Symmetry: C2
Subunit: 161 residues, 2 copies
């Protein structure tokens, strides 16, 4: 029956698209981390302008709460409920850790070093102001993403049996 | 059924890249709301004006991620031209940001100039990047409709 398969595909694709939106929000924070202590140069490269990171981190913070918000609305019956919940828990822990470090992350003149302990994956100087939570959230959304992609693959495969 | 199987497969992948590019644009909208702001103990944003240079560098590096995602999107006939158009718009957006480095790449980037670069519908003007951002957003909307329409005609 082609109709049953047609709905299976559209529903699997819709869940994948919803998950990939959250993972792209996460990937944008990785892009923000590249800009810590940087300014745009005339030639398109980045140059140093150190320790003015507060509004960059403020942007990273509201993206992180947008991640939690979008994950809170995903409740289908497909079977990803436990992977979704694990990602939402990680997203809350990341936002709470940022907010909890406002004395270094929410002042005029936030330093490069403190910003990197918040959003730079694999930061060498430490991970105590958000990075550990960011890495876990990243892995949690990536697991979910691969899982929803494999569901879409198996639904599209049913077209030919 | 053969025709439809390809159209589903080709439209899904384009939809995938587009929705992830649109999420990157939503991240730039969050950056725009954070202009001149800092984090507070309760999660709200408080005012701390005119230090937007790394925020703008962050928007800029996102804009190059958008272009790279669009440049490797290698789609089917009937979507290829809308892909190429979106790629061109994303390039014009990054170019306009860098061309305005005299206001956007200095120590102490002002709230006013940051808003003319990344805040959609900024009241004082759109002359440092917003016009290109609005055009890129419209170009992605055209592409999204065309690819989602192929999936619909495919469910026939």
């Amino acid at each position: 029956n082609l109709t049953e398969i047609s709905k299976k595909i559209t529903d699997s694709n819709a869940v994948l698209l919803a998950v990939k939106e959250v993972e792209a929000l996460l990937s944008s924070i990785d892009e923000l981390a590249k800009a810590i202590g940087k300014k745009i140069k005339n030639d398109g490269s980045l140059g140093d302008e150190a320790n003015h990171n507060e509004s960059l981190l403020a942007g990273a913070y509201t993206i992180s709460t947008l991640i939690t918000q979008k994950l809170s609305k995903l409740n289908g019956s497909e079977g990803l409920k436990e992977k979704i919940a694990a990602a939402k828990k990680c997203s809350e822990e990341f936002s709470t850790k940022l907010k909890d470090n406002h004395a270094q992350l929410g002042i005029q003149g936030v330093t490069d070093e403190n910003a990197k302990k918040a959003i730079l994956k694999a930061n060498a100087a430490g991970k105590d102001k958000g990075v550990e939570e960011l890495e876990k959230l990243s892995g949690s959304l990536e697991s979910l993403s691969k899982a929803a992609k494999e569901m879409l693959a198996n639904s599209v495969k049913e077209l030919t049996s």
